[PDB]
Amino acid sequence: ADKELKFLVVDDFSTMRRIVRNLLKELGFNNVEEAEDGVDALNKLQAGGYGFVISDWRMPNMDGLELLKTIRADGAMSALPVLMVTAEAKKENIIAAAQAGASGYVVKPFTAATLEEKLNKIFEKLGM
Numbered sequence: 001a002d003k004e005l006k007f008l009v010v011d012d013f014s015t016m017r018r019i020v021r022n023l024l025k026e027l028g029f030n031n032v033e034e035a036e037d038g039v040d041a042l043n044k045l046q047a048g049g050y051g052f053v054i055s056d057w058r059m060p061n062m063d064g065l066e067l068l069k070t071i072r073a074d075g076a077m078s079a080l081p082v083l084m085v086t087a088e089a090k091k092e093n094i095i096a097a098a099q100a101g102a103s104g105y106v107v108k109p110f111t112a113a114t115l116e117e118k119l120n121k122i123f124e125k126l127g128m
């Protein structure tokens with residue numbers, strides 16, 4: 001995938017944002033921004049330029065499902081790759097996020113390899 005692709009990592013806890021950010025760096029992605037919740041993420045997305053979004057689920061103000069539904073419902077970013085990286089592991093949740101339009105879904109804790117696979121799987125599905 002184009003290494004200049006701009007990523008937006010969303011999670012209410014920095015620890016996870018730092019993990020995702022550093023992993024993207026390893027894969028060759030340095031154009032990466034962060035966000036602490038759904039609202040904060042929509043704001044930055046509003047500032048245009050993003051081509052991929054990795055997001056957590058449980059977050060205050062606006063959670064990950066709501067954020068995914070928002071992105072998908074907006075014609076200016078409806079096809080925006082959204083990879084869910086959450087600790088929510090119940091199948092009723094994986095179904096909800098998948099049905100809402102999730103590009104992928106990874107459960108915490110995850111390995112470096114798992115993230116790369118799931119990311120490459122997205123790039124492959126969308127021809128990136």
Ligand code: BEF
Pocket residue numbers: 056057058059085086087088108
């Ligand atoms: F709070 Be996240 F869903 F890990």
Ligand SMILES: [Mn+2]
Pocket residue numbers: 011012013056057058059
């Ligand atoms: Mn969280």
